[PDB]
């Protein structure tokens, strides 16, 4: 058992964090006060769930997590919600003035007032670990805190925890639910400065989640609460291999080995099926073949792009529920006879499979129906370059006129940083083209 | 030199001082360094009684300063309706042009003095007169979207 520490930065990272830990408690049987009756070893243990939860002498199971925000409103809701007793109060850190949707305030001016306090509180959690493997960092690309503070934190973590793995869950901006006009700037700036400090990053495109809520869940105008519940289901499916017994992606190093062929192209695409509305409580159960085929439909992706336009470098299928291995073998065999699935000539054409035989858990109040079998596919495809192209284009339209740049320069940032970040994004786009 | 004192009295509105200075031989057509006369100054500072007194004692109603401004240009610019009427009755050239190509109509239109605009049009102001940039008073009303002025100029 090797511990994982989760860090939630800014509004999006905090709100997604709260939805994730609620779901983890339900999957493991942990009550809102931290009590876990199925845990026979009180005050300690080396069970697989201990990777995410420590134990006190009174049998309290406490998340190995830190929540950070430059203003207090969002974290204040965690401090007073249903799960207020679950977290280490010193684990919820807030400032008084936010980054005003400005990467430079998050990274250089406001962020520097709290950076040492955050690192000292993270060290207190790390000191409690016997074999810390690394960190899971949740944050938006668009916010000033989510972009700027996260980059500053990732730079410091690389110095203080050199050999530890760092994985991100990043929220990629969409127009339908955006906060700010400068979100493309913040997104490019944070991508450039975190690229060398992050081992693997799962981007969640708010437009993809918003479309799924509208199409599959019949939600007229999805709010953050509906987006976050679906995102937490997907995040749980990705982290289940770390919290339960299994043979695939059992540690952070294995995520890099299976999904990241080269350090810079470290952005896997997640696909999840089936997503069924809770109002369809008597829905016909979908077979292993039907859910597996659904992983190759662009409509089920966490990022909007078309893998038919790209090539695969890795593909991992993670099943949960009533799934017989021979049925997976047969579904994959059928899927291989498909013209739209191409691998690069330097990777084996294989699909890695992991099965957890417990079906997914639904949260009370959620929008999803209970299902007997579900699958999350994680792939490294060159088609994710389409997400970067879309973002780089919005950056270029504004930057050509130097629109809004004065706000960044006025907050301790040199204008050359924008060109250096953009040049790194052009090189990233070429890295995907050179592979295929 | 009573001319310099008469320029000061006309600007300051000292009616009694104007009468005494003229009675003592003060030049009613004296000019300051920029070519302004007592009549230009009384018309600029709105001293109606001084304007009337000066006109009954030989003031040139059409005197121009170094920039081609007449007393009528200044009264129309500042918005002194009663003085504009007195100047027109005493022979002021309604279509006098200064060094910027402006007529009194251009100045009353720019400054929004609509009652003075009406008065000037009634006394033959030329609506086709162009300033040094080719603008008529109608062009100024269309360019600034002053619909009230545009209606008056079209009557």
């Amino acid at each position: 058992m090797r511990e994982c520490i989760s860090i939630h930065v800014g509004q999006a990272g905090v709100q997604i964090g709260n939805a994730c830990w609620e779901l983890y408690c339900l999957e493991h049987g942990i009550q809102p006060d931290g009590q876990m009756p199925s845990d026979k070893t009180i005050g300690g243990g080396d069970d697989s769930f201990n990777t995410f939860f420590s134990e006190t002498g009174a049998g309290k199971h406490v998340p190995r997590a830190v929540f950070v925000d430059l203003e207090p409103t969002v974290i204040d809701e965690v401090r007073t919600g249903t799960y207020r007793q679950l977290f280490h109060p010193e684990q919820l850190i807030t400032g008084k003035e936010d980054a005003a949707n400005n990467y430079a305030r998050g990274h250089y001016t406001i962020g520097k007032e709290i950076i040492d306090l955050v690192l000292d509180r993270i060290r207190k959690l790390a000191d409690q670990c016997t074999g810390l493997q690394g960190f899971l960092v949740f944050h938006s690309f668009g916010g000033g805190t989510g972009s700027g503070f996260t980059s500053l934190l990732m730079e410091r973590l690389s110095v203080d925890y050199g050999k530890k793995s760092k994985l991100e869950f990043s929220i990629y901006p969409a127009p339908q639910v955006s906060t700010a006009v400068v979100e493309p700037y913040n997104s490019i700036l944070t991508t450039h400065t975190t690229l060398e400090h992050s081992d693997c990053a799962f981007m969640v495109d708010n437009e993809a989640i918003y479309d799924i809520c509208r199409r599959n869940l019949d939600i007229e105008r999805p709010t953050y609460t509906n987006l976050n519940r679906l995102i937490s289901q997907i995040v749980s499916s990705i982290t289940a291999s770390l919290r339960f017994d299994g043979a695939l992606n059992v540690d952070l190093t294995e995520f890099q080995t299976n999904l990241v062929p080269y350090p810079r192209i470290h952005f896997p695409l997640a696909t999840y099926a089936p997503v069924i509305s809770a109002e369809k409580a008597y829905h016909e159960q979908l077979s292993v073949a039907e859910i597996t085929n659904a992983c190759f439909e662009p409509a089920n992706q966490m990022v909007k792009c078309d893998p038919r336009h790209g090539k695969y470098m890795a593909c991992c299928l993670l099943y949960r529920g009533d799934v017989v291995p021979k049925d997976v073998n047969a579904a994959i065999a059928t899927i291989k006879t498909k013209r739209s699935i191409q691998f690069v000539d330097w990777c084996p054409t294989g699909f890695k499979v992991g099965i957890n035989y417990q079906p997914p858990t639904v949260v009370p109040g959620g929008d999803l129906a209970k299902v007997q079998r579900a699958v999350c596919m994680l792939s490294n495809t060159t088609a994710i370059a389409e997400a970067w192209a879309r973002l780089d284009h919005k950056f270029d339209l504004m930057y050509a006129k130097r629109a809004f740049v004065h706000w960044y320069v006025g907050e301790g940032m040199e204008e050359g940083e924008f060109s250096e970040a953009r040049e790194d994004m052009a090189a990233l786009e070429k890295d995907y083209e050179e592979v295929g | 030199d009573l001319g310099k004192k008469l320029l000061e009295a006309a600007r300051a509105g000292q009616d009694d001082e104007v009468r005494i200075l003229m009675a003592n031989g003060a030049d009613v057509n004296a000019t300051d360094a920029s070519g302004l006369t007592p009549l230009h100054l009384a018309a600029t500072y709105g001293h109606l009684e001084i304007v009337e007194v000066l006109l009954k004692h030989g003031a040139d109603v059409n005197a121009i300063d170094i920039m081609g401004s007449t007393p009528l240009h200044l009264a129309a610019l500042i918005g002194h309706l009663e003085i504009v009427e007195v100047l027109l009755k005493h022979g002021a050239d309604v279509n006098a042009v200064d060094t910027w190509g402006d007529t009194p109509l251009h100045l009353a239109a720019i400054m929004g003095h609509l009652e003075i605009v009406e008065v000037l049009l009634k006394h033959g102001a030329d609506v086709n007169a162009q300033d040094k940039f080719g603008k008529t008073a109608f062009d100024i009303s269309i360019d600034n979207g002053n619909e009230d002025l545009a209606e008056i100029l079209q009557k």
Binding site: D98, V181, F404 | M67, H73, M111, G112
Partner: protein, 426 residues
């Protein structure tokens, strides 16, 4: 980001400032004595942004009242909410400024500036997290214009990191035929370009035009004009005063609305337009983008929107607002710059203003604002060319070069708007 310190200077500033306090106190359930009598928790959620909390749970406006003319203090005091203001927050001089910008900025105004700064200091020190300042004033007079701009600069020196916002009333000969007003306005605009983060341009030309041609009022009074002002002020401050989906503040508004530092002059708009004592979502979105509903006498169809913020108030489907707002952007796509993606932001607030079930407030950063600046510049130039009344300014210490510099800066501002109006994405 919570507290805002409000300052009102000169006659216009104090008159519109008092109307602001009357209108927003009614929205927050606050009576003239300072007691809360409302029926919603939403009214007190962000009350600390504009009011200080005092003994007996008495809410007191964070407002400083300034004027070189002492008669303004009595007119404020005799208003319905005249007793709500902190007695130590009234800073009044002995003699007015006589519509002279030089008196307000250099002589009488400069003698009373340190007194106002002590009052700003005490109010600022008792803030947990000051976000900035809001000033109400006219540009055509002497006190709001000359002293207001001097006050902005001194506050800017002591509090550089805070936001400075103004509600600045533009002069028009339709409301006040005083020929020195284009001089006072131009000298003030030179100061506002350098020293404010955001300025709402409230044009008396537009206010007169709405009252006369739209509302059918043949003889508009200041009370009629100020009715449109208070409605606009209530609308543009909605997201600062009510919770909503966005935790809005003055700095997030500036970062998202101001792409170039000097282009921070907004054109506000309001719908429906009403007169004193006298709509569906598609109608509201249409009226909101119409020239007839703008508070600056500019035609938005003569320019391009750089950024827009729109606030809808009342009970309505947010999906409908999203649809209709997307619609206006499709049919009027030529009136938006194509190089600032997603430049229109929408907010919906549950609580509508008094007497209205539905309302919409528009805040546009439009290149068509150059029409307002060109109007004042042409009047400044007509007066300045003839040196009319220049001695009234140079006699108070002013240099004739300050007029030249102000004129050159405003003409440069008009050229900068034209530059971005003609720019293409390519």
């Amino acid at each position: 980001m919570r507290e805002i310190v409000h300052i009102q200077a000169g006659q216009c500033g104090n008159q519109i400032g008092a109307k602001f306090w009357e209108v927003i106190s009614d929205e927050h359930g606050i009576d003239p004595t300072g007691s809360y009598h409302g029926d919603s928790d939403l009214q007190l959620e962000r009350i600390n942004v504009y009011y200080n909390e005092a003994t007996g749970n008495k809410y007191v406006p964070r407002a400083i009242l300034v004027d070189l003319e002492p008669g303004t203090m009595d007119s404020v005091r005799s208003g319905p909410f005249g007793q709500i203001f902190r007695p130590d927050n009234f800073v009044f001089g002995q003699s007015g400024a006589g519509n002279n910008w030089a008196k307000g900025h250099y002589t009488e105004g400069a003698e009373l500036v340190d007194s106002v700064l002590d009052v700003v200091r005490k109010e600022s020190e008792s803030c947990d997290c000051l976000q900035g300042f809001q000033l109400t004033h006219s540009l055509g007079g002497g006190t709001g214009s000359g002293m207001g701009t001097l006050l902005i600069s001194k506050i800017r020196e002591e509090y550089p990191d805070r936001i400075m916002n103004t509600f600045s009333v533009m002069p028009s000969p339709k409301v006040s035929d005083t020929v020195v007003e284009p001089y006072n306005a131009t000298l003030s605009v030179h100061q506002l370009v350098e020293n404010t983060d955001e300025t709402y341009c409230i044009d008396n030309e537009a206010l007169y035009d709405i009252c006369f041609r739209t509302l059918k009022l043949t003889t508009p009074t200041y009370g009629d004009l100020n009715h449109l002002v208070s409605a606009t002020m209530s609308g543009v401050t909605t997201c600062l005063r009510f919770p909503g989906q966005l935790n809005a503040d003055l700095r997030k508004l500036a970062v998202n609305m101001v792409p170039f530092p000097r282009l921070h002059f907004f054109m506000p708009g309001f719908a429906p337009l009403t007169s004193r004592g006298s709509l569906t979502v598609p109608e509201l979105t249409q009226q909101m983008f119409d020239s007839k509903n703008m508070m600056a006498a500019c035609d938005p169809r003569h320019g391009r929107y750089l950024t827009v913020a729109a606030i809808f108030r009342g009970r309505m489907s947010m999906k409908e607002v999203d649809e209709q707002m997307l619609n206006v952007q499709n049919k009027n796509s030529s009136y938006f710059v194509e190089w600032i993606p997603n430049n229109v932001k929408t907010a919906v607030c549950d609580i509508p203003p008094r007497g209205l079930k539905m309302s919409a407030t528009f805040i546009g950063n439009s290149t068509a604002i150059q029409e307002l600046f060109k109007r004042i510049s042409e009047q400044f130039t007509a007066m300045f060319r003839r040196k009319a009344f220049l001695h009234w300014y140079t006699g108070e210490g002013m240099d004739e070069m300050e007029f030249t510099e102000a004129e050159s800066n405003m003409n440069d501002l008009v050229s900068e708007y034209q530059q971005y109006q003609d720019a293409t994405a390519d």
